[PDB]
Design a protein around this nucleic acid. Structure first.
Ligand SMILES: [Mg+2]
Ligand SMILES: [Zn+2]
Lengths: 1320, 609
DNA sequence: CTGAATCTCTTCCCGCGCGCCGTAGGAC
DNA sequence: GTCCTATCGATCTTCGGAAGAGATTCAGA
RNA sequence: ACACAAACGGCGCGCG
């Protein structure tokens, strides 16, 4: 095995066994594909803006036989780059511009064009470009749009249990949910009659639609009911028996034929009886005529002998009616075949309920219901009815919707119209009847197959279409009104509505998230998050336990563990590591195929509905390297149920054991040993983690560290195969191999590192180099580390030295003990950045200005400001120190000062102004400075570009115009001066000079464009016409009360800092960094943490022994033998390394990196086993048990028997105490109610909760309570008097009267109620 | 809208409101603190008492005016701290967790000043508060006036509230760590260093252990003195020799007088400590109890550290029978499935027989696993070997009752066992794997159903229960004890719940603290054993159960004839005071809260002679 | 005047931390 | 551009839930 | 003149 230069510096030891085939797929695939699919001007009519337009357009007006017709669009480049846009604090939007044809066809003639004009590229649009990392930049903001899980467009079938009208009955429900438009629902009444309702409107009989669909009663019965027949055959009306229908019947009379009786009154009928009956030609039997009367007629009938019609379909029979139809001369009477359970009369039942008879009545009736209290009109009814379900503009089923629908009806053909049709309704209706008759099965809404995922691209398009609809109303009227001979399209359509719709959607939609930029892992998990909420979804309270609980289909698709705490439980979900989405939007996962006897490397993606058919073995199942399972049978899930199956009796296998979890869980090693509850906690806490200044790496890893860092995009990547030549810790530039050097290209790539900048959660994101000049890099190699990363390895926290034991109660409960060494060692020191900005107002008493001439303020603060009234960069400030010296007339210190209770250093100034505003010295220098920085980058880029351009000139100078003795001393622009004709050398000089001028022009125009952009002001909000932004940096150590977490769900707050002497220490004189409460382990059942600490301890020992040799001058041979033996240790591990090849130089480099401790990988469900751990400990310098004796640092005596000592990876959560502790003695009060202000941002007071009053009430204390509300909350008079009394030392209160009570009285009195206080 | 509902004035402002002189902080545990004390950060303290500080400054005359005083405070000068200490010298303070469960949820403390920013809490008290230090915040309020200060000190002060009001039982029972250390200390070792000597008393016992010449739980003979309080309460001493382990003798030194040595001459789990402390208080009263608790707390931490009661993976011994029983059970299950294939049994019978096979298999694993761990110690004693209860870390933690249960160890060491879908149907194959060895993917996936369900139930339950309590408090609030006697001679009769055959509760516990409605008929006939309205406190209840009583008639609050309230005699004993209630107390809120807290713990998802 | 099968305005733990964000139409 | 001025109320992405008691209401008795 | 200071209502995400 061989490794890259980046890989070949910390070759993480691995213990995974399974040689998985499929790599980890690119994480952000879903988002990027979603938007790419949406944004492209795809010529094909499906999806994207093009599809939306084709749905809408052409748009026409009856008025003049005139329309405007669609042509494809153009997309403009953004006004600013990401950072300029971010810096300016606006949305990173691109403009939309389209072509359309506006026409006027001729009247009174075949509709040829009187006039048609194609639009001059009308523009109306501003949409945010998906940023490189898949995020969207909003005004001064970066946002992530989560993917929504919603009920798929399709036909559903459902039944109720126990809720069935209290009757103990079964009620069946069928629903049609279009991709867009009206809902349609069918229901079985407790009285067994079938009813329909639209958009949850009032109950109606289904039969009404059938008439609306222009079907007569007999046609309806023919569609729904099979016939049973009687005929005059030599005597009264013999029945046309089909014996199979006697299934489960008991005869009420003799059933006989061919001189043989098969059944008699009271005798059951069975299949073997039936076989004789039909085989013996029983096709006619004279049932006793009363049995005929029991049936219901299947048709209306005439008395053709008199031209009269007296008989009604659905009419129940009687003996006289038999005479009447026989009197009419009918040879036959047709009746509806039915059984009390096999064939129900539900349609006939409905027919009795139905008052409507004709299509006129149906159309009128339905219209009336849809249009309560409104004038009916036959064509109006029809047109309305058409809108209901037969026009895309009001009812539409997407391609997936139709496909889903056809699948439900068991159609082998999946395609179909987006609108409904009579047959489709009939099939659905029949299915519900089939279910009622006990020959159908209900769906599971929770089953994934019924559920589909929406992404940014899909949702945006729908939002975009909505805006067009609002355009439709405007344009249509205008087109109707317009003269059309001088009006042009830009007049007909105005941007404002469309822009707002998308604009407001991004900023306001629940699914638009202010990104949790906390740390790299936080972003990525946050970005691949699935939510059930939002429109078309459920709501955080309306969710039964069943939906919240994990479903079997979720396996390998939705991580069961990641769901966050609280009401979000089960509502918010994350994709699996190997998750993929079907073209239909179905979440799909890959599987390997059991090809005959051998599992094979072919991979196929399945949705749950596919998986139900097959049987799939567990990923970790053994196999013989040919594919045959080592065991002749294996554990597999067939229909989700777990059972064992034979080799070649199984069908599929799971590609990877890690396939079940999401990345967030994946980082947890030894997860297989730990209880879910703690595991869930660990996953959420990961994103809670905050970076550390001295971050190095995780010791006990899982194998996701490289992948997560790369896909996160926070780290820099080698876009081309190249070698490095520069370093400034601000930029990196790469010289690229010729094979990737392009013919008219520089041959070099430069990158600019992002430096200290506040995150969405007020944390710095500065990148750092990890390379040197002249160092080679493959394409895709890691160029620069970012927060919580090293060598492109995800590194959230620190590897601590820890032991488990009680310690004088200071670590009781989750309490965590800490040593003064760790803080001195800087492990968990962290940096925070805060932004403070000030605006100048158009105050009516005179506008504001920034000045150093602040009224009456002390000199010292003024000294901190410059003469511009602005604090200097690099200054150190504390609460109350002046930052911005803004003032108001009538002059006044309307200035910005440091928030109380905070201290920090000052690094930023960004100044903005409206048009027509003058600048200050500070802004001018900064603006000019930035200009210069851009110029410098351009010059250096130019320097290489011209250097490559010079290379072309110098190369030919080797052979033509040879002047090597003075080659470049004849200036490289003077090289043209050679007095030559079209000779080879001159042609190069003359033509490349033009390119040399163009190159010069490009930098000039780029330079001019850059500074022009930098020069211009901004379109600030009204009432203010200059803004200043200031950033402040805070460095934070660890204090008691800070929240700390271990990956294995072991969260706790630290409360102590000890003189290093106190800590327990080993016989080798080494104290521990941390001590943890042991009793939590059995309570939490997360033993895996102990496995981590044991393994990490062994990992540290390997590094230590390495360090000793490197600390010594041991020869490379010792190093070679030691390390190689280290890696080769273990069971049939998948990993290998060939250290001998690495030149003995990278060995030192690699070895040096190792001396900190051995980095190890641990697949989520294929980690190392104990026996391997024991060997490593033996290879280390510790007993196989891992426990060690220790000595009290206070007394020097030994603790009783060995204890657990180990190295563990520990994380800091972004909840440190100082950011939460708050206290207020006195402060302002709210206007609407004199009670104190609330919260920390404002100097608000704590709320005495309602329940806590009850607790107070429980005790007999009353004076306290009286004081609580009167003095401390709601009495201006008393509290003020109280204030004085305290200064007077009386500590006495006057009773007073709560002011808010007066407010209530006023409001009540403001009602129609008279309310008073009674003296007596 | 401003009036009605949750957002209305009633809830928004009236029945709950923001209050000045308040603060919130993150919690921490201070072992050094005495029960009545609490530690708070200087930063909050400096703010909270500014009006007090100004008064002292102007009383000092150092501040010419309020603004000058405020100006000096900005300095945070040494003198400010001196005055702040003087001001805070005894001023009580209020600390409450949120949401409060009951009146115990809020209690008063005396403050001590801290340099950091967290608020420090005594470990024994926090348990009553239900505080978990995984990041819990807490809110603080200061009583201003003379009346409030006395109110806070008299009632809310922690020393007053050792007894639960829902049940007259100590809520102070020690922590997991404190109890375990004592449990380890009180255990005995068959043979140990320094074993077999005779000691005059604890004084030399401590010295001998401190010198390391004898082990803590080594067996030893000791001379000891103990006190009995006479028929009136006069405490007189007796001296005797005992055979014991050393740790017991040293712990006895902490025990105050008047308590028999026998109670401590045994391994002390949370069970023993619970009743020992409870009985101790009743025998000796409150004042010795509170100081007794602190010494218990201090000692437990100290020797828990010395014990080095760590836990390691090696500690989790796995029975070899686990594989044997699993393989044995699997064979039988295969027979059942085959017999179903033979048609010899229905699917349901096939299914339920299999789970029964698993149930037996799991239990046999529990037998092997549990029996081995406790049995795991063979030791030599002057030659020859003997068996004793194991000193295993895991066994001690569960056996002591400090944390966990037999189920936890059974999962970890035995098998995670049978498991069910969200529907409650048991998967026809249990989770045969333990945790010491990792689960298989499907097994782990199966477990996810149960875990989430538990979380799901908790989430909605906690929301549903609160809305219930609100209903309770409103209706209950009106009732107040105002009368001494209502006059009734009537009452209800009490019995032990006799269900599932014989009793499932003792009549002793229920009749306790009530008052008779009629004189108790003595065993026999016509003789009366107790007066008709006797406060049925402990001894009489013991006296009654000593007799052949089956049921007794007692007055009740419902029978109480009081107007606009309740009479004390109908209510009888107060849970939080032992003696009869003081007039003028609103019991209704107490009852409501008493029910409210435990409700959260519910779920929303012939035989003998 | 009896009968359900019909019928709609109450309620949905207590507190805390950021972030964003609020009438339409017009002298041209 | 600034600043004035009069209503405010239809058709579009809607439905996304459900326990419990006073009218009004279905079937005769 | 010896004195006020910057919250009204929603939404999302997290917290015990
Ligand atoms: Mg907690
Ligand atoms: Zn009474």
């Amino acid at each position: 095995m061989v490794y890259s230069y980046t890989e070949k510096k910390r070759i993480r030891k691995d213990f995974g066994k399974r040689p998985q085939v499929l790599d980890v797929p690119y994480l952000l695939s879903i988002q990027l594909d979603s938007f790419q699919k949406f944004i492209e001007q795809d010529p094909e009519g499906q999806y994207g803006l093009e599809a939306a337009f084709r749905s809408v357009f052409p748009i026409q007006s009856y008025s003049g036989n005139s329309e405007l017709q669609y042509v494809s669009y153009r997309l403009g480049e953004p006004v600013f780059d990401v950072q300029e846009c971010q810096i300016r604090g606006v949305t990173y939007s691109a403009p939309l511009r389209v072509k359309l044809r506006l026409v006027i066809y001729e009247r009174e003639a075949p509709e040829g064009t009187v006039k048609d004009i194609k639009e001059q590229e009308v523009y109306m649009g501003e949409i945010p470009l998906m940023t490189d990392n898949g995020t969207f930049v909003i005004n001064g903001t970066e946002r992530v749009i989560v993917s929504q899980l919603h009920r798929s467009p399709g036909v559903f079938f459902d039944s109720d249990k126990g809720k069935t009208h209290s009757s103990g009955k079964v009620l069946y429900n069928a629903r049609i949910i279009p991709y867009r438009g009206s809902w349609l629902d069918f229901e079985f009444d407790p009285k067994d009659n079938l009813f329909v309702r639209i958009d949850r409107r009032r109950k109606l009989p289904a039969t009404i639609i059938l008439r609306a669909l222009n079907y007569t009663t007999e046609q309806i019965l023919d569609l729904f009911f099979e016939k049973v027949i009687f005929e005059i055959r030599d005597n009264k009306l013999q029945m046309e028996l089909v014996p199979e229908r006697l299934r489960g019947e008991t005869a009420s009379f003799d059933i006989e034929a061919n001189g043989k009786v098969y059944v008699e009154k009271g005798r059951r009928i069975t299949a073997r009886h039936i076989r004789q009956l039909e085989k013996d030609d029983v096709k006619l039997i004279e049932v006793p005529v009363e049995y005929i009367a029991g049936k219901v007629v299947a048709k209306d009938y005439i008395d053709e002998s008199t031209g009269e019609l007296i008989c009604a379909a659905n009419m129940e029979l009687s003996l006289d009616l038999l005479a009447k139809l026989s009197q009419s001369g009918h040879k036959r009477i047709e009746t509806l075949f039915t059984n009390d359970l096999d064939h129900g009369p539900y349609i006939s039942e409905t027919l009795r309920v139905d008052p409507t008879n004709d299509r006129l009545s149906a159309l009128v009736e339905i219209y009336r219901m849809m249009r309560p209290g409104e004038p009916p009109t036959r064509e109006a009814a029809e047109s309305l009815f058409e809108n209901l379900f037969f026009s895309e503009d009001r009812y539409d089923l997407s391609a997936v919707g139709r496909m889903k629908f056809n699948r439900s009806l068991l159609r082998e053909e999946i395609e179909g119209s987006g609108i409904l049709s009579k047959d489709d309704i009939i099939d659905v209706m029949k299915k519900l009847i089939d279910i009622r008759n006990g020959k159908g099965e209900v769906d599971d809404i929770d089953h994934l197959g019924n559920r589909r995922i929406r992404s940014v691209g899909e949702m945006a398009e729908n939002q975009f279409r909505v805006g067009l609809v609002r355009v439709e109303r405007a344009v249509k009227e205008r087109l109707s009104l317009g003269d059309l001979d001088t009006l042009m399209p830009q007049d007909m359509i105005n941007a404002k509505p469309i822009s707002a719709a998308v604009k407001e959607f991004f900023g306001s939609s629940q699914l638009s998230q202010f990104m949790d930029q906390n740390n790299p892992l936080s972003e990525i998990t946050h970005k691949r998050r699935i939510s059930a909420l939002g429109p078309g979804g459920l709501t955080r309270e309306r969710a039964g336990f069943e939906v919240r609980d994990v479903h079997p289909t979720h396996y390998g698709r939705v991580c069961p563990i990641e769901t966050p705490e609280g009401p979000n439980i089960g509502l918010i979900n994350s994709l699996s590591v190997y998750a993929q989405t079907n073209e239909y939007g179905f979440l799909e996962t890959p599987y390997r195929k059991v090809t005959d006897g051998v599992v094979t490397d072919e991979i196929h993606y399945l949705s749950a509905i596919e998986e139900g058919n097959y049987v799939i073995a567990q990923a970790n199942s053994n196999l013989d390297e040919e594919g045959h399972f080592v065991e002749d049978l294996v554990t597999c899930r067939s229909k989700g149920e777990s059972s064992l199956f034979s080799r070649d009796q199984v069908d599929y296998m799971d590609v990877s054991t890690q396939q079940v979890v999401s990345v967030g869980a994946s980082l947890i090693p030894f997860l297989e040993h730990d209880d879910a509850n703690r595991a869930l906690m660990g996953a959420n806490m990961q994103r809670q983690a905050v970076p550390t200044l001295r971050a190095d790496k995780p010791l006990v890893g899982t194998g996701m560290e490289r992948a997560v860092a790369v896909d996160s995009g926070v780290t820099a990547v080698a876009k081309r195969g190249g070698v490095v030549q520069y370093v400034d810790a601000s930029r990196i530039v790469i010289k690229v191999n010729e094979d990737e050097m392009y013919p008219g290209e520089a041959g070099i790539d430069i990158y600019n590192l992002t430096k200290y900048t506040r995150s969405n959660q007020n944390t710095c994101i500065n990148q750092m180099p990890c390379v040197s000049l002249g160092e080679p890099v493959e394409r895709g190699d890691v160029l620069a580390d970012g927060p919580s990363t090293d060598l492109g390895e995800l590194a959230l926290g620190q590897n601590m030295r820890v032991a488990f034991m009680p310690w004088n109660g200071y670590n009781f409960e989750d309490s965590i003990l800490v040593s003064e060494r760790v803080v001195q060692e800087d492990r968990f020191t962290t940096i925070h950045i805060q932004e403070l900005a000030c605006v100048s107002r158009d105050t009516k008493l005179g506008p504001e200005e920034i000045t150093a001439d602040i009224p009456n303020v002390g000199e010292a603060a003024l000294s901190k400001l410059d003469e511009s009234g602005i604090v200097y960069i690099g200054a150190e400030v504390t609460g109350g120190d002046i930052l911005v010296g803004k003032v108001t007339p009538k002059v006044k210190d309307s200035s910005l000062r440091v928030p109380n209770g905070v201290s920090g250093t000052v690094i930023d100034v960004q100044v903005f102004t409206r048009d027509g505003v003058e600048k200050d010295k500070r802004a001018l220098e900064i603006e000019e400075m930035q200009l210069k920085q851009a110029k410098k980058d351009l010059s250096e880029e130019l320097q290489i570009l011209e250097a490559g351009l010079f290379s072309r000139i110098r190369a030919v100078l080797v052979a033509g115009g040879v002047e090597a003795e003075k080659l470049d001393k004849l200036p490289r622009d003077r090289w043209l001066e050679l007095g030559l004709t079209d000779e080879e050398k001159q042609n190069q000089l003359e033509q490349l000079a033009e390119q040399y001028d163009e190159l010069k022009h490009e930098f000039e125009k780029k330079l001019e464009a850059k500074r022009r952009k930098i020069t211009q002001g901004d379109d600030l909000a009204p009432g203010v016409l200059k803004i200043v932004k200031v950033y402040l940096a805070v460095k934070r150590r660890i204090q008691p009360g800070d929240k700390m977490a271990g990956r294995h769900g072991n969260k706790g707050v630290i409360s102590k800092i000890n003189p290093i002497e106190d800590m327990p220490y080993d016989e080798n004189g080494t104290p521990v960094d941390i001590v943890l409460n042991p009793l939590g382990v059995p309570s939490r059942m997360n033993i895996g943490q102990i496995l981590e600490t044991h393994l990490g301890m062994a990992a540290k020992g390997i590094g230590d022994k390495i360090n000793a040799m490197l600390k010594q001058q041991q020869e490379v041979a010792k190093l070679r033998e030691f390390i190689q033996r280290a890696y080769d240790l273990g069971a049939d591990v998948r990993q290998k390394v060939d250290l001998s090849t690495f030149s003995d130089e990278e060995v030192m480099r690699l070895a040096e990196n190792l001396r900190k401790g051995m980095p190890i990988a641990t697949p989520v469900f294929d980690g190392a086993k104990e026996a391997e751990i024991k060997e490593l400990l033996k290879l280390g310098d510790l007993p196989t048990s891992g426990q060690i004796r220790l000595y009290d640092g206070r007394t020097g005596e030994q603790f009783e028997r060995p204890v657990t000592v180990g190295y563990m990876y520990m994380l800091k959560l972004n909840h440190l105490v100082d950011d939460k502790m708050h206290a207020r003695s006195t402060g302002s009060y709210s206007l609407v109610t004199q009670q104190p202000l609330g919260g920390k941002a404002q100097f608000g007071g704590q709320r005495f909760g309602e329940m806590e009053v009850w607790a107070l009430e429980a005790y007999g204390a009353a004076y306290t309570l009286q004081e609580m509300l009167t003095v401390k909350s709601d009495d201006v008079n008393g509290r003020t008097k109280m204030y004085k009394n305290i200064v007077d030392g009386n500590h006495q209160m006057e009773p007073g009267m709560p002011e808010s009570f007066n407010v209530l009285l006023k409001e009540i009195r403001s009602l129609g109620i008279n309310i008073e206080l009674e003296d007596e | 809208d401003m009036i009605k509902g949750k957002q209305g004035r009633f809830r928004q402002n009236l029945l709950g409101k923001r209050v000045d002189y308040s603060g919130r902080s993150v919690i921490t545990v201070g072992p050094y603190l005495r029960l009545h004390q609490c530690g708070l950060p200087k930063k909050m303290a400096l703010e909270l008492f500014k009006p007090f500080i100004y008064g002292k400054l102007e009383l000092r005359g150092l501040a010419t005016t309020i603004k000058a005083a405020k100006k000096m405070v900005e300095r945070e000068e040494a003198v400010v701290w001196d005055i702040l200490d003087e001001v805070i010298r005894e001023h009580p303070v209020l600390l409450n967790r949120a949401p409060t469960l009951h009146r115990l949820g809020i209690q008063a403390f005396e403050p001590v000043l801290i340099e950091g920013k967290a608020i420090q809490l005594h470990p024994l008290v926090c348990a009553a508060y239900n505080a978990d230090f995984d990041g819990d915040q807490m809110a603080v309020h200061v009583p201003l006036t003379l009346e409030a200060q006395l109110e806070a000190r008299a009632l809310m002060m922690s020393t007053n509230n050792i007894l639960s009001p829902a049940n007259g039982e100590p809520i102070i029972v020690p922590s997991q760590d404190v109890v375990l250390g004592l449990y380890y200390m009180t255990r005995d070792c068959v043979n140990a260093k320094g074993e077999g000597m005779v000691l005059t008393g604890p004084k030399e016992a401590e010295r001998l252990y401190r010198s390391g010449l004898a082990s803590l739980h080594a067996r030893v003979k000791v001379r000891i003195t103990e006190y009995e309080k006479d028929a009136n309460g006069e405490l007189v001493a007796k001296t005797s020799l005992k055979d014991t382990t050393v740790g017991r003798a040293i712990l006895w030194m902490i025990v105050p007088k008047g308590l028999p040595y026998s109670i401590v001459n045994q391994a002390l789990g949370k069970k023993a400590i619970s009743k020992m402390l409870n009985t101790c208080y009743r025998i000796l009263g409150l004042k010795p109890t509170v100081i007794f608790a602190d010494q218990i707390m201090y000692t437990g931490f100290a020797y828990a550290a010395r014990s080095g009661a760590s836990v390691g993976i090696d500690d989790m011994v796995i029975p070899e029978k686990k594989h044997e029983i699993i393989s044995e059970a699997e064979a039988e299950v295969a027979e059942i499935q085959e017999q179903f294939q033979s048609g010899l049994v229905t699917a349901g019978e096939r299914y339920n027989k299999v789970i029964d096979i698993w149930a037996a298999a799991n239990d046999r694993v529990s037998k092997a696993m549990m029996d081995n761990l406790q049995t795991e110690t063979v030791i030599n004693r002057d030659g020859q070997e003997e068996k004793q209860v194991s000193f295993n870390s895991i066994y001690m933690m569960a056996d002591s009752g400090a944390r966990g249960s037999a189920a936890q160890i059974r999962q970890l060491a035995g098998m995670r066992g049978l498991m069910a879908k969200p529907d409650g149907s048991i998967i026809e194959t249990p989770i045969t794997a333990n945790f010491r060895e990792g689960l298989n993917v499907l097994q782990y996936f199966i477990s996810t159903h149960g875990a989430r369900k538990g979380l799901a139930d908790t989430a909605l339950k906690t929301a549903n229960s609160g809305y219930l309590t609100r209903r309770l408090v409103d209706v209950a609030q009106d009732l107040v004890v105002t009368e001494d006697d209502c006059g009734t001679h009537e009452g209800i009769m009490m019995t032990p719940v006799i269900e599932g055959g014989d009793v499932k509760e003792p009549l002793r516990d229920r009749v306790l603290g009530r008052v008779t409605a009629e004189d108790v008929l003595k065993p026999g006939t016509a003789d009366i054993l107790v007066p008709r309205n006797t406060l049925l406190h402990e001894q009489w209840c013991d006296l009654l159960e000593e007799n052949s009583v089956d049921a007794v008639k007692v007055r009740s609050v419902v029978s109480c004839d009081t107007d606009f309230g309740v009479c004390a005699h109908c209510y009888g004993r107060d849970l939080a005071r032992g003696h009869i209630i003081n007039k003028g107390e609103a019991i209704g809120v107490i009852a409501a809260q008493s029910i409210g807290e435990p409700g959260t713990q519910l779920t929303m998802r012939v035989k003998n002679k």
